[PDB]
Amino acid sequence: SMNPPPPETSNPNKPKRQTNQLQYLLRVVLKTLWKHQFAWPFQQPVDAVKLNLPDYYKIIKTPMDMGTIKKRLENNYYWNAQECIQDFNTMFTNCYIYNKPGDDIVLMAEALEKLFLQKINELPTEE
Ligand SMILES: Cc1cc(-c2nc3ccccc3n2CC2CCOCC2)cn(C)c1=O
């Protein structure tokens, strides 16, 4: 039932970087995905309590949402783009794992992933 602590968005020990690839992930990719009509269910951690999904965090052991990714990019938490791209891929994969094919949330995830792949193909080379 109980919601776990959200994923870490702050860690003063962890060394941080501002790269053009990370600037692109915030300014181009996240901005595009966040404003999409199907973004809202992905903008915050799954609230298992509110949704009465006591199973959710029994099945999903690496939760991720765009709220966390947004916080991680705004607060320069990442070392490289691969870390941030992994977070997006975890958010999509968690959706496909927990939910059934054809479910509304999976159709929303599929739309968002398509856009995400488009923008990631155009990832700038490291400056
Ligand atoms: C299982 C699940 C639920 C939601 C979710 N978050 C909601 C917030 C408020 C209200 C409903 C919420 N849901 C359920 C879906 C919302 C969109 O339509 C399908 C149900 C999001 N994701 C990524 C999931 O994997």
PDB file of N, CA and C in Angstrom, residues 24-125:
ATOM      1  N   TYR A  24      20.353  19.681 -23.990  1.00  0.00           N
ATOM      2  CA  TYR A  24      19.401  19.271 -25.054  1.00  0.00           C
ATOM      3  C   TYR A  24      18.273  18.439 -24.437  1.00  0.00           C
ATOM      4  N   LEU A  25      18.612  17.515 -23.532  1.00  0.00           N
ATOM      5  CA  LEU A  25      17.606  16.620 -22.901  1.00  0.00           C
ATOM      6  C   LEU A  25      16.613  17.452 -22.092  1.00  0.00           C
ATOM      7  N   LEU A  26      17.062  18.535 -21.446  1.00  0.00           N
ATOM      8  CA  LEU A  26      16.137  19.415 -20.687  1.00  0.00           C
ATOM      9  C   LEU A  26      15.376  20.325 -21.658  1.00  0.00           C
ATOM     10  N   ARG A  27      16.101  21.031 -22.528  1.00  0.00           N
ATOM     11  CA  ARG A  27      15.575  22.188 -23.298  1.00  0.00           C
ATOM     12  C   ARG A  27      14.710  21.699 -24.464  1.00  0.00           C
ATOM     13  N   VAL A  28      15.026  20.535 -25.040  1.00  0.00           N
ATOM     14  CA  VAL A  28      14.340  19.997 -26.254  1.00  0.00           C
ATOM     15  C   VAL A  28      13.470  18.789 -25.888  1.00  0.00           C
ATOM     16  N   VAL A  29      14.044  17.744 -25.288  1.00  0.00           N
ATOM     17  CA  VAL A  29      13.348  16.434 -25.118  1.00  0.00           C
ATOM     18  C   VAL A  29      12.269  16.549 -24.033  1.00  0.00           C
ATOM     19  N   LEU A  30      12.670  16.851 -22.794  1.00  0.00           N
ATOM     20  CA  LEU A  30      11.764  16.994 -21.618  1.00  0.00           C
ATOM     21  C   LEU A  30      10.696  18.046 -21.931  1.00  0.00           C
ATOM     22  N   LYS A  31      11.082  19.223 -22.435  1.00  0.00           N
ATOM     23  CA  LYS A  31      10.118  20.311 -22.762  1.00  0.00           C
ATOM     24  C   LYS A  31       9.047  19.774 -23.720  1.00  0.00           C
ATOM     25  N   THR A  32       9.441  19.086 -24.798  1.00  0.00           N
ATOM     26  CA  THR A  32       8.502  18.458 -25.770  1.00  0.00           C
ATOM     27  C   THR A  32       7.608  17.464 -25.024  1.00  0.00           C
ATOM     28  N   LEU A  33       8.194  16.492 -24.321  1.00  0.00           N
ATOM     29  CA  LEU A  33       7.415  15.390 -23.700  1.00  0.00           C
ATOM     30  C   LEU A  33       6.465  15.958 -22.639  1.00  0.00           C
ATOM     31  N   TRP A  34       6.941  16.874 -21.800  1.00  0.00           N
ATOM     32  CA  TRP A  34       6.167  17.418 -20.656  1.00  0.00           C
ATOM     33  C   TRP A  34       4.856  18.042 -21.142  1.00  0.00           C
ATOM     34  N   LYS A  35       4.882  18.740 -22.282  1.00  0.00           N
ATOM     35  CA  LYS A  35       3.749  19.562 -22.801  1.00  0.00           C
ATOM     36  C   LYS A  35       2.752  18.685 -23.583  1.00  0.00           C
ATOM     37  N   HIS A  36       3.063  17.401 -23.810  1.00  0.00           N
ATOM     38  CA  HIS A  36       2.219  16.470 -24.607  1.00  0.00           C
ATOM     39  C   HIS A  36       0.923  16.168 -23.841  1.00  0.00           C
ATOM     40  N   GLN A  37      -0.179  15.935 -24.556  1.00  0.00           N
ATOM     41  CA  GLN A  37      -1.518  15.700 -23.949  1.00  0.00           C
ATOM     42  C   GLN A  37      -1.474  14.463 -23.041  1.00  0.00           C
ATOM     43  N   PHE A  38      -0.580  13.499 -23.292  1.00  0.00           N
ATOM     44  CA  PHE A  38      -0.546  12.201 -22.571  1.00  0.00           C
ATOM     45  C   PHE A  38       0.548  12.197 -21.494  1.00  0.00           C
ATOM     46  N   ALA A  39       1.172  13.345 -21.225  1.00  0.00           N
ATOM     47  CA  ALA A  39       2.318  13.483 -20.296  1.00  0.00           C
ATOM     48  C   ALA A  39       1.857  13.385 -18.839  1.00  0.00           C
ATOM     49  N   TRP A  40       0.652  13.869 -18.496  1.00  0.00           N
ATOM     50  CA  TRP A  40       0.277  14.139 -17.080  1.00  0.00           C
ATOM     51  C   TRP A  40       0.407  12.885 -16.200  1.00  0.00           C
ATOM     52  N   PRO A  41       0.087  11.647 -16.645  1.00  0.00           N
ATOM     53  CA  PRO A  41       0.236  10.484 -15.769  1.00  0.00           C
ATOM     54  C   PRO A  41       1.703  10.137 -15.485  1.00  0.00           C
ATOM     55  N   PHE A  42       2.626  10.775 -16.189  1.00  0.00           N
ATOM     56  CA  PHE A  42       4.081  10.495 -16.080  1.00  0.00           C
ATOM     57  C   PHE A  42       4.815  11.640 -15.385  1.00  0.00           C
ATOM     58  N   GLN A  43       4.100  12.667 -14.913  1.00  0.00           N
ATOM     59  CA  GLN A  43       4.729  13.931 -14.447  1.00  0.00           C
ATOM     60  C   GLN A  43       5.080  13.836 -12.963  1.00  0.00           C
ATOM     61  N   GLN A  44       4.719  12.735 -12.312  1.00  0.00           N
ATOM     62  CA  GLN A  44       4.958  12.543 -10.861  1.00  0.00           C
ATOM     63  C   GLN A  44       5.050  11.050 -10.644  1.00  0.00           C
ATOM     64  N   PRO A  45       5.669  10.623  -9.531  1.00  0.00           N
ATOM     65  CA  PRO A  45       5.720   9.208  -9.194  1.00  0.00           C
ATOM     66  C   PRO A  45       4.315   8.605  -9.095  1.00  0.00           C
ATOM     67  N   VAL A  46       4.182   7.334  -9.465  1.00  0.00           N
ATOM     68  CA  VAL A  46       2.910   6.581  -9.294  1.00  0.00           C
ATOM     69  C   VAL A  46       2.578   6.583  -7.801  1.00  0.00           C
ATOM     70  N   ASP A  47       1.440   7.185  -7.473  1.00  0.00           N
ATOM     71  CA  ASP A  47       0.913   7.265  -6.094  1.00  0.00           C
ATOM     72  C   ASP A  47       0.047   6.025  -5.874  1.00  0.00           C
ATOM     73  N   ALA A  48       0.663   4.915  -5.481  1.00  0.00           N
ATOM     74  CA  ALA A  48      -0.033   3.626  -5.294  1.00  0.00           C
ATOM     75  C   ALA A  48      -1.182   3.779  -4.294  1.00  0.00           C
ATOM     76  N   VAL A  49      -1.053   4.671  -3.318  1.00  0.00           N
ATOM     77  CA  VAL A  49      -2.068   4.859  -2.246  1.00  0.00           C
ATOM     78  C   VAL A  49      -3.330   5.460  -2.875  1.00  0.00           C
ATOM     79  N   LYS A  50      -3.172   6.578  -3.579  1.00  0.00           N
ATOM     80  CA  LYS A  50      -4.253   7.319  -4.274  1.00  0.00           C
ATOM     81  C   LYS A  50      -4.950   6.405  -5.291  1.00  0.00           C
ATOM     82  N   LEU A  51      -4.193   5.615  -6.045  1.00  0.00           N
ATOM     83  CA  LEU A  51      -4.732   4.756  -7.126  1.00  0.00           C
ATOM     84  C   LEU A  51      -5.156   3.385  -6.573  1.00  0.00           C
ATOM     85  N   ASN A  52      -4.956   3.124  -5.280  1.00  0.00           N
ATOM     86  CA  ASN A  52      -5.301   1.841  -4.603  1.00  0.00           C
ATOM     87  C   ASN A  52      -4.624   0.707  -5.378  1.00  0.00           C
ATOM     88  N   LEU A  53      -3.330   0.872  -5.667  1.00  0.00           N
ATOM     89  CA  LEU A  53      -2.473  -0.139  -6.334  1.00  0.00           C
ATOM     90  C   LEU A  53      -1.418  -0.594  -5.338  1.00  0.00           C
ATOM     91  N   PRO A  54      -1.788  -1.393  -4.315  1.00  0.00           N
ATOM     92  CA  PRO A  54      -0.819  -1.856  -3.317  1.00  0.00           C
ATOM     93  C   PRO A  54       0.202  -2.798  -3.967  1.00  0.00           C
ATOM     94  N   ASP A  55      -0.123  -3.314  -5.150  1.00  0.00           N
ATOM     95  CA  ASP A  55       0.732  -4.235  -5.940  1.00  0.00           C
ATOM     96  C   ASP A  55       1.846  -3.452  -6.652  1.00  0.00           C
ATOM     97  N   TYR A  56       1.669  -2.148  -6.897  1.00  0.00           N
ATOM     98  CA  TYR A  56       2.507  -1.432  -7.884  1.00  0.00           C
ATOM     99  C   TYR A  56       3.981  -1.558  -7.505  1.00  0.00           C
ATOM    100  N   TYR A  57       4.319  -1.204  -6.262  1.00  0.00           N
ATOM    101  CA  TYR A  57       5.721  -1.177  -5.763  1.00  0.00           C
ATOM    102  C   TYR A  57       6.169  -2.557  -5.276  1.00  0.00           C
ATOM    103  N   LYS A  58       5.294  -3.555  -5.363  1.00  0.00           N
ATOM    104  CA  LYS A  58       5.675  -4.983  -5.212  1.00  0.00           C
ATOM    105  C   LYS A  58       6.186  -5.511  -6.557  1.00  0.00           C
ATOM    106  N   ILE A  59       5.790  -4.899  -7.673  1.00  0.00           N
ATOM    107  CA  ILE A  59       6.150  -5.368  -9.042  1.00  0.00           C
ATOM    108  C   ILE A  59       7.256  -4.461  -9.581  1.00  0.00           C
ATOM    109  N   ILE A  60       7.129  -3.147  -9.380  1.00  0.00           N
ATOM    110  CA  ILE A  60       8.100  -2.147  -9.914  1.00  0.00           C
ATOM    111  C   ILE A  60       9.089  -1.795  -8.806  1.00  0.00           C
ATOM    112  N   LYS A  61      10.345  -2.213  -8.963  1.00  0.00           N
ATOM    113  CA  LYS A  61      11.414  -2.012  -7.955  1.00  0.00           C
ATOM    114  C   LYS A  61      12.389  -0.926  -8.422  1.00  0.00           C
ATOM    115  N   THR A  62      12.235  -0.382  -9.636  1.00  0.00           N
ATOM    116  CA  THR A  62      13.055   0.758 -10.123  1.00  0.00           C
ATOM    117  C   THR A  62      12.129   1.815 -10.706  1.00  0.00           C
ATOM    118  N   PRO A  63      11.315   2.481  -9.859  1.00  0.00           N
ATOM    119  CA  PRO A  63      10.343   3.435 -10.355  1.00  0.00           C
ATOM    120  C   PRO A  63      11.047   4.661 -10.944  1.00  0.00           C
ATOM    121  N   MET A  64      10.395   5.277 -11.915  1.00  0.00           N
ATOM    122  CA  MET A  64      10.894   6.517 -12.538  1.00  0.00           C
ATOM    123  C   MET A  64       9.703   7.239 -13.146  1.00  0.00           C
ATOM    124  N   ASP A  65       9.759   8.561 -13.101  1.00  0.00           N
ATOM    125  CA  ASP A  65       8.736   9.429 -13.715  1.00  0.00           C
ATOM    126  C   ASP A  65       9.438  10.673 -14.240  1.00  0.00           C
ATOM    127  N   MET A  66       8.740  11.467 -15.043  1.00  0.00           N
ATOM    128  CA  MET A  66       9.341  12.648 -15.695  1.00  0.00           C
ATOM    129  C   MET A  66       9.531  13.787 -14.693  1.00  0.00           C
ATOM    130  N   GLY A  67       8.701  13.836 -13.648  1.00  0.00           N
ATOM    131  CA  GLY A  67       8.862  14.739 -12.492  1.00  0.00           C
ATOM    132  C   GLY A  67      10.267  14.648 -11.922  1.00  0.00           C
ATOM    133  N   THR A  68      10.683  13.433 -11.572  1.00  0.00           N
ATOM    134  CA  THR A  68      12.052  13.089 -11.107  1.00  0.00           C
ATOM    135  C   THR A  68      13.093  13.468 -12.164  1.00  0.00           C
ATOM    136  N   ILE A  69      12.858  13.129 -13.429  1.00  0.00           N
ATOM    137  CA  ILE A  69      13.835  13.405 -14.519  1.00  0.00           C
ATOM    138  C   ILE A  69      13.990  14.923 -14.649  1.00  0.00           C
ATOM    139  N   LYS A  70      12.880  15.656 -14.633  1.00  0.00           N
ATOM    140  CA  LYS A  70      12.833  17.140 -14.671  1.00  0.00           C
ATOM    141  C   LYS A  70      13.654  17.692 -13.501  1.00  0.00           C
ATOM    142  N   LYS A  71      13.377  17.234 -12.282  1.00  0.00           N
ATOM    143  CA  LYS A  71      14.131  17.643 -11.066  1.00  0.00           C
ATOM    144  C   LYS A  71      15.617  17.327 -11.249  1.00  0.00           C
ATOM    145  N   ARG A  72      15.947  16.120 -11.727  1.00  0.00           N
ATOM    146  CA  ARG A  72      17.361  15.700 -11.923  1.00  0.00           C
ATOM    147  C   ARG A  72      18.061  16.631 -12.932  1.00  0.00           C
ATOM    148  N   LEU A  73      17.401  17.051 -14.012  1.00  0.00           N
ATOM    149  CA  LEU A  73      18.021  17.917 -15.054  1.00  0.00           C
ATOM    150  C   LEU A  73      18.124  19.370 -14.583  1.00  0.00           C
ATOM    151  N   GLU A  74      17.091  19.882 -13.921  1.00  0.00           N
ATOM    152  CA  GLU A  74      17.043  21.285 -13.430  1.00  0.00           C
ATOM    153  C   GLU A  74      18.098  21.492 -12.339  1.00  0.00           C
ATOM    154  N   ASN A  75      18.399  20.442 -11.569  1.00  0.00           N
ATOM    155  CA  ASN A  75      19.323  20.502 -10.406  1.00  0.00           C
ATOM    156  C   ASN A  75      20.656  19.843 -10.787  1.00  0.00           C
ATOM    157  N   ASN A  76      20.912  19.677 -12.093  1.00  0.00           N
ATOM    158  CA  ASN A  76      22.144  19.073 -12.674  1.00  0.00           C
ATOM    159  C   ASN A  76      22.605  17.917 -11.788  1.00  0.00           C
ATOM    160  N   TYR A  77      21.831  16.832 -11.781  1.00  0.00           N
ATOM    161  CA  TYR A  77      22.103  15.609 -10.986  1.00  0.00           C
ATOM    162  C   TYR A  77      22.940  14.634 -11.820  1.00  0.00           C
ATOM    163  N   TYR A  78      22.782  14.668 -13.136  1.00  0.00           N
ATOM    164  CA  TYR A  78      23.380  13.663 -14.051  1.00  0.00           C
ATOM    165  C   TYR A  78      24.849  13.995 -14.339  1.00  0.00           C
ATOM    166  N   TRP A  79      25.639  12.951 -14.598  1.00  0.00           N
ATOM    167  CA  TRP A  79      27.026  13.050 -15.112  1.00  0.00           C
ATOM    168  C   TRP A  79      27.021  13.091 -16.641  1.00  0.00           C
ATOM    169  N   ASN A  80      26.174  12.285 -17.275  1.00  0.00           N
ATOM    170  CA  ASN A  80      26.131  12.187 -18.755  1.00  0.00           C
ATOM    171  C   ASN A  80      24.687  11.957 -19.203  1.00  0.00           C
ATOM    172  N   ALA A  81      24.461  12.032 -20.516  1.00  0.00           N
ATOM    173  CA  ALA A  81      23.140  11.876 -21.161  1.00  0.00           C
ATOM    174  C   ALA A  81      22.650  10.433 -21.023  1.00  0.00           C
ATOM    175  N   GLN A  82      23.547   9.433 -21.083  1.00  0.00           N
ATOM    176  CA  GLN A  82      23.201   7.987 -20.950  1.00  0.00           C
ATOM    177  C   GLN A  82      22.399   7.726 -19.663  1.00  0.00           C
ATOM    178  N   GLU A  83      22.709   8.437 -18.577  1.00  0.00           N
ATOM    179  CA  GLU A  83      22.069   8.266 -17.246  1.00  0.00           C
ATOM    180  C   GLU A  83      20.620   8.735 -17.348  1.00  0.00           C
ATOM    181  N   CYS A  84      20.430   9.873 -18.002  1.00  0.00           N
ATOM    182  CA  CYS A  84      19.114  10.527 -18.168  1.00  0.00           C
ATOM    183  C   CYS A  84      18.277   9.731 -19.171  1.00  0.00           C
ATOM    184  N   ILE A  85      18.912   9.233 -20.233  1.00  0.00           N
ATOM    185  CA  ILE A  85      18.246   8.411 -21.276  1.00  0.00           C
ATOM    186  C   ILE A  85      17.788   7.099 -20.635  1.00  0.00           C
ATOM    187  N   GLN A  86      18.599   6.554 -19.730  1.00  0.00           N
ATOM    188  CA  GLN A  86      18.274   5.312 -18.970  1.00  0.00           C
ATOM    189  C   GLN A  86      17.020   5.560 -18.114  1.00  0.00           C
ATOM    190  N   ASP A  87      16.922   6.725 -17.460  1.00  0.00           N
ATOM    191  CA  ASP A  87      15.754   7.123 -16.632  1.00  0.00           C
ATOM    192  C   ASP A  87      14.511   7.135 -17.534  1.00  0.00           C
ATOM    193  N   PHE A  88      14.525   7.827 -18.679  1.00  0.00           N
ATOM    194  CA  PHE A  88      13.371   7.773 -19.613  1.00  0.00           C
ATOM    195  C   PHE A  88      13.016   6.325 -19.958  1.00  0.00           C
ATOM    196  N   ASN A  89      14.011   5.534 -20.348  1.00  0.00           N
ATOM    197  CA  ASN A  89      13.784   4.128 -20.772  1.00  0.00           C
ATOM    198  C   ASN A  89      13.198   3.312 -19.607  1.00  0.00           C
ATOM    199  N   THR A  90      13.592   3.577 -18.362  1.00  0.00           N
ATOM    200  CA  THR A  90      13.046   2.891 -17.163  1.00  0.00           C
ATOM    201  C   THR A  90      11.572   3.272 -16.968  1.00  0.00           C
ATOM    202  N   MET A  91      11.250   4.551 -17.122  1.00  0.00           N
ATOM    203  CA  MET A  91       9.864   5.055 -16.982  1.00  0.00           C
ATOM    204  C   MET A  91       8.975   4.330 -17.997  1.00  0.00           C
ATOM    205  N   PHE A  92       9.377   4.271 -19.264  1.00  0.00           N
ATOM    206  CA  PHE A  92       8.578   3.584 -20.314  1.00  0.00           C
ATOM    207  C   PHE A  92       8.478   2.092 -19.985  1.00  0.00           C
ATOM    208  N   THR A  93       9.602   1.438 -19.679  1.00  0.00           N
ATOM    209  CA  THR A  93       9.646  -0.031 -19.443  1.00  0.00           C
ATOM    210  C   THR A  93       8.780  -0.413 -18.238  1.00  0.00           C
ATOM    211  N   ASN A  94       8.827   0.348 -17.131  1.00  0.00           N
ATOM    212  CA  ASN A  94       7.986   0.118 -15.926  1.00  0.00           C
ATOM    213  C   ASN A  94       6.502   0.104 -16.313  1.00  0.00           C
ATOM    214  N   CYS A  95       6.092   1.061 -17.145  1.00  0.00           N
ATOM    215  CA  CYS A  95       4.710   1.174 -17.663  1.00  0.00           C
ATOM    216  C   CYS A  95       4.347  -0.129 -18.396  1.00  0.00           C
ATOM    217  N   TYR A  96       5.205  -0.585 -19.324  1.00  0.00           N
ATOM    218  CA  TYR A  96       4.924  -1.756 -20.204  1.00  0.00           C
ATOM    219  C   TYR A  96       4.914  -3.034 -19.355  1.00  0.00           C
ATOM    220  N   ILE A  97       5.723  -3.068 -18.298  1.00  0.00           N
ATOM    221  CA  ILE A  97       5.820  -4.240 -17.374  1.00  0.00           C
ATOM    222  C   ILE A  97       4.536  -4.303 -16.556  1.00  0.00           C
ATOM    223  N   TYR A  98       4.172  -3.210 -15.889  1.00  0.00           N
ATOM    224  CA  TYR A  98       3.105  -3.260 -14.867  1.00  0.00           C
ATOM    225  C   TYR A  98       1.743  -3.424 -15.544  1.00  0.00           C
ATOM    226  N   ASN A  99       1.547  -2.729 -16.660  1.00  0.00           N
ATOM    227  CA  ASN A  99       0.234  -2.637 -17.346  1.00  0.00           C
ATOM    228  C   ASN A  99       0.153  -3.689 -18.458  1.00  0.00           C
ATOM    229  N   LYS A 100      -1.063  -3.922 -18.969  1.00  0.00           N
ATOM    230  CA  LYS A 100      -1.383  -4.930 -20.022  1.00  0.00           C
ATOM    231  C   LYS A 100      -1.354  -4.276 -21.398  1.00  0.00           C
ATOM    232  N   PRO A 101      -1.026  -5.031 -22.476  1.00  0.00           N
ATOM    233  CA  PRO A 101      -1.091  -4.491 -23.832  1.00  0.00           C
ATOM    234  C   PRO A 101      -2.496  -3.933 -24.104  1.00  0.00           C
ATOM    235  N   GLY A 102      -2.575  -2.760 -24.733  1.00  0.00           N
ATOM    236  CA  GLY A 102      -3.861  -2.124 -25.080  1.00  0.00           C
ATOM    237  C   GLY A 102      -4.390  -1.207 -23.984  1.00  0.00           C
ATOM    238  N   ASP A 103      -3.864  -1.297 -22.757  1.00  0.00           N
ATOM    239  CA  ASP A 103      -4.288  -0.418 -21.635  1.00  0.00           C
ATOM    240  C   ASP A 103      -4.084   1.036 -22.058  1.00  0.00           C
ATOM    241  N   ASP A 104      -4.939   1.936 -21.570  1.00  0.00           N
ATOM    242  CA  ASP A 104      -4.872   3.375 -21.925  1.00  0.00           C
ATOM    243  C   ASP A 104      -3.463   3.889 -21.618  1.00  0.00           C
ATOM    244  N   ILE A 105      -2.899   3.497 -20.473  1.00  0.00           N
ATOM    245  CA  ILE A 105      -1.629   4.096 -19.983  1.00  0.00           C
ATOM    246  C   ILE A 105      -0.499   3.647 -20.918  1.00  0.00           C
ATOM    247  N   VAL A 106      -0.587   2.431 -21.442  1.00  0.00           N
ATOM    248  CA  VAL A 106       0.408   1.856 -22.390  1.00  0.00           C
ATOM    249  C   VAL A 106       0.309   2.603 -23.723  1.00  0.00           C
ATOM    250  N   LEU A 107      -0.904   2.906 -24.188  1.00  0.00           N
ATOM    251  CA  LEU A 107      -1.109   3.692 -25.432  1.00  0.00           C
ATOM    252  C   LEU A 107      -0.481   5.081 -25.277  1.00  0.00           C
ATOM    253  N   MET A 108      -0.567   5.660 -24.076  1.00  0.00           N
ATOM    254  CA  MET A 108      -0.003   6.989 -23.763  1.00  0.00           C
ATOM    255  C   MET A 108       1.528   6.877 -23.752  1.00  0.00           C
ATOM    256  N   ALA A 109       2.051   5.863 -23.063  1.00  0.00           N
ATOM    257  CA  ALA A 109       3.503   5.578 -22.982  1.00  0.00           C
ATOM    258  C   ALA A 109       4.056   5.380 -24.403  1.00  0.00           C
ATOM    259  N   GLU A 110       3.335   4.665 -25.276  1.00  0.00           N
ATOM    260  CA  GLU A 110       3.802   4.344 -26.656  1.00  0.00           C
ATOM    261  C   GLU A 110       3.914   5.644 -27.462  1.00  0.00           C
ATOM    262  N   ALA A 111       2.932   6.536 -27.346  1.00  0.00           N
ATOM    263  CA  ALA A 111       2.947   7.856 -28.018  1.00  0.00           C
ATOM    264  C   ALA A 111       4.172   8.644 -27.550  1.00  0.00           C
ATOM    265  N   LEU A 112       4.414   8.666 -26.235  1.00  0.00           N
ATOM    266  CA  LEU A 112       5.496   9.478 -25.631  1.00  0.00           C
ATOM    267  C   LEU A 112       6.849   8.888 -26.045  1.00  0.00           C
ATOM    268  N   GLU A 113       6.967   7.564 -26.079  1.00  0.00           N
ATOM    269  CA  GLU A 113       8.234   6.864 -26.411  1.00  0.00           C
ATOM    270  C   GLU A 113       8.620   7.181 -27.866  1.00  0.00           C
ATOM    271  N   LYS A 114       7.642   7.165 -28.779  1.00  0.00           N
ATOM    272  CA  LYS A 114       7.829   7.498 -30.219  1.00  0.00           C
ATOM    273  C   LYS A 114       8.478   8.887 -30.331  1.00  0.00           C
ATOM    274  N   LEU A 115       7.920   9.891 -29.653  1.00  0.00           N
ATOM    275  CA  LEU A 115       8.463  11.272 -29.655  1.00  0.00           C
ATOM    276  C   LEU A 115       9.873  11.251 -29.086  1.00  0.00           C
ATOM    277  N   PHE A 116      10.058  10.482 -28.017  1.00  0.00           N
ATOM    278  CA  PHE A 116      11.327  10.416 -27.263  1.00  0.00           C
ATOM    279  C   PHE A 116      12.417   9.879 -28.200  1.00  0.00           C
ATOM    280  N   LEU A 117      12.109   8.811 -28.933  1.00  0.00           N
ATOM    281  CA  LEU A 117      13.034   8.175 -29.913  1.00  0.00           C
ATOM    282  C   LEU A 117      13.384   9.193 -31.008  1.00  0.00           C
ATOM    283  N   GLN A 118      12.379   9.896 -31.541  1.00  0.00           N
ATOM    284  CA  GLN A 118      12.588  10.960 -32.556  1.00  0.00           C
ATOM    285  C   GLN A 118      13.648  11.943 -32.045  1.00  0.00           C
ATOM    286  N   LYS A 119      13.455  12.494 -30.842  1.00  0.00           N
ATOM    287  CA  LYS A 119      14.307  13.587 -30.302  1.00  0.00           C
ATOM    288  C   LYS A 119      15.689  13.036 -29.944  1.00  0.00           C
ATOM    289  N   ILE A 120      15.765  11.785 -29.486  1.00  0.00           N
ATOM    290  CA  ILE A 120      17.047  11.133 -29.077  1.00  0.00           C
ATOM    291  C   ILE A 120      17.908  10.832 -30.315  1.00  0.00           C
ATOM    292  N   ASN A 121      17.297  10.501 -31.458  1.00  0.00           N
ATOM    293  CA  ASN A 121      18.004  10.353 -32.765  1.00  0.00           C
ATOM    294  C   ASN A 121      18.757  11.653 -33.099  1.00  0.00           C
ATOM    295  N   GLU A 122      18.186  12.810 -32.766  1.00  0.00           N
ATOM    296  CA  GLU A 122      18.775  14.141 -33.066  1.00  0.00           C
ATOM    297  C   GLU A 122      19.625  14.637 -31.878  1.00  0.00           C
ATOM    298  N   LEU A 123      20.033  13.762 -30.950  1.00  0.00           N
ATOM    299  CA  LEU A 123      20.930  14.135 -29.815  1.00  0.00           C
ATOM    300  C   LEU A 123      22.208  14.765 -30.375  1.00  0.00           C
ATOM    301  N   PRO A 124      22.583  15.996 -29.971  1.00  0.00           N
ATOM    302  CA  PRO A 124      23.811  16.616 -30.458  1.00  0.00           C
ATOM    303  C   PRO A 124      25.041  15.812 -30.013  1.00  0.00           C
ATOM    304  N   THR A 125      26.135  15.878 -30.770  1.00  0.00           N
ATOM    305  CA  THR A 125      27.428  15.267 -30.362  1.00  0.00           C
ATOM    306  C   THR A 125      27.981  16.133 -29.227  1.00  0.00           C
TER     307      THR A 125
END
